[PDB]
Amino acid sequence: HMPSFDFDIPRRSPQEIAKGMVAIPGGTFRMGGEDPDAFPEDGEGPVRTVRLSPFLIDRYAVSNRQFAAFVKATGYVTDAERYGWSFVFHAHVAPGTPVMDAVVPEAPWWVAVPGAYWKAPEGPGSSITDRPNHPVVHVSWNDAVAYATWAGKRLPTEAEWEMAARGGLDQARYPWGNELTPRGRHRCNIWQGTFPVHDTGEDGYTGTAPVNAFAPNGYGLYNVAGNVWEWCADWWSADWHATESPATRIDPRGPETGTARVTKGGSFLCHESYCNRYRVAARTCNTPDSSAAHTGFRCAADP
Amino acid sequence: ATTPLCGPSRASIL
Ligand SMILES: *[C@@H](O)c1ccccc1N
Ligand SMILES: [Ca+2]
Ligand SMILES: [Ca+2]
Ligand SMILES: [Cu+]
16 A cells, blocks of 8 residues: 655654554464354455564554544544545434435444544534543544554554454454353443344443453453454455465465455444454455544554 | 445445
8 A cells, every 4th residue: 555645754763652552472373263153255264374473563442632642743634524424323423413314225323424523423513522542433544544654653464453352362252262241241342232223331331432441352452352443454355365375374464456444353333133243353344435433443563 | 134234335325
């Protein structure tokens, strides 16, 4: 990818860049999944051994406070602002808010809301004053790359994201192991109840949670499962990674072309009855200038 | 009925 920016890249020291990041040592892990109920068109498989070079990855998704600092320093205008609208979950749109009649095929719970963007996540009249340490949302893949580059970082590849999210466990279902709520404790912010009609908020949150909510995984990362989808660097495909080759097994970058970029981790809207995509092997995609109330990102860096 | 949708795209509404 060759992005274009209207701000200069500031100088930063290695110690500044590494703050809030964990160092993942070079090594191998088993990427992918073989859950029999996986949508075969997501390409969760095959399970494969991948070798990665050492990298740094953020413990937390990028927060509102951090994104605000980026925008203050650069004047950056997000894709949602240029388009003038972004996607908000229906239950979060305040009655009377102007809404577009647009329908996302097969997903009528999404509402295109003029004026919804990172600083007004539910549209005009909403704010992030009470959400400084929540993940920034309504950020597109382009916005994420812009932030990451300004910060001296980059987006993780899907394999880097998944190695870090797995937190040192071999082929577990979730970042922490194989039970969704071990010892009856909620470990991530997803949906409980009847999707899309009623979220019971059993896990504490019916929207985003702070980036440091819940216990971390074994590598110190927080909310890799649930909370917000997280953009990764790779172009999406369902089958590029089915090939056995150095390109797909050593520091894999994904296909060289595509139309949508990979997103990982699931969000506060995920539920087993619909999209069971908070499993660490799960994956989906979105087009790179798209944005939504349940999608953000975390950064990676070369040491 | 079809693959569940988690990522709503700007193109999808056109
Ligand atoms: C259709 O196939 C469908 C619809 C809702 C939830 C799951 C599935 N598979
Ligand atoms: Ca929740
Ligand atoms: Ca996540
Ligand atoms: Cu989902």
